[PDB]
Write a protein that binds this DNA or RNA. Structure first.
Ligand SMILES: [K+]
Ligand SMILES: [Mg+2]
Length: 101
RNA sequence: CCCGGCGACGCGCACGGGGACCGCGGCGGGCGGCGCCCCGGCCCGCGAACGCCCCGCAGCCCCCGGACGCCUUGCGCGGAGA
């Protein structure tokens, strides 16, 4: 719990300082179908037709997909932006371990 | 047979575009009065519905691509993609 999230926070910052990533749904689809996505991270108010499609595309590519436990605004705050982020796709973990998940 | 659309819609200060009207100047034709002045006053110079081509701000949409910007008198908009 409390130990769990302070690792999720720690990893989410590690990628945005040293390691590639993209923010947004249209950038996330174009990468998953090409097999570049090590992880996919979604918000809990992600639109329901769009979420269904992201999971289907993920199982075909074997790309892991999790669910961040906050709104699309929290995800914006978490990776350090002033705008809402429905989907975050990590391309290279860099210095993050990604075991936190 | 079923599901829809057009017909089909309130009020308001402002801001913007089109048409008609209205003026000023030129130039073409005609008038008036004129003791002095007057290229200084007056009248007339017109183009429809409809058919074909082109051109149309705002506004909504497509493609690339992935962001400390775009923009109104006022605002407003953008990782749900500027
Ligand atoms: K009516
Ligand atoms: Mg009526």
């Amino acid at each position: 719990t409390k130990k769990a999230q302070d690792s999720i926070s720690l990893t989410l910052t590690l990628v945005v300082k040293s390691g590639k990533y993209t923010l947004g749904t249209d950038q996330a689809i174009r990468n998953i179908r090409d097999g570049k996505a090590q992880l996919v991270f979604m918000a809990n108010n992600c639109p329901p037709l769009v979420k269904s499609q992201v999971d289907y595309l993920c199982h075909l590519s074997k790309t892991p997909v999790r669910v961040f436990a906050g709104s699309s605004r929290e995800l914006g705050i978490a990776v350090g932006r002033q705008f809402n982020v429905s989907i975050m796709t990590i391309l290279e973990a860099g210095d993050a371990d990604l075991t936190s998940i």
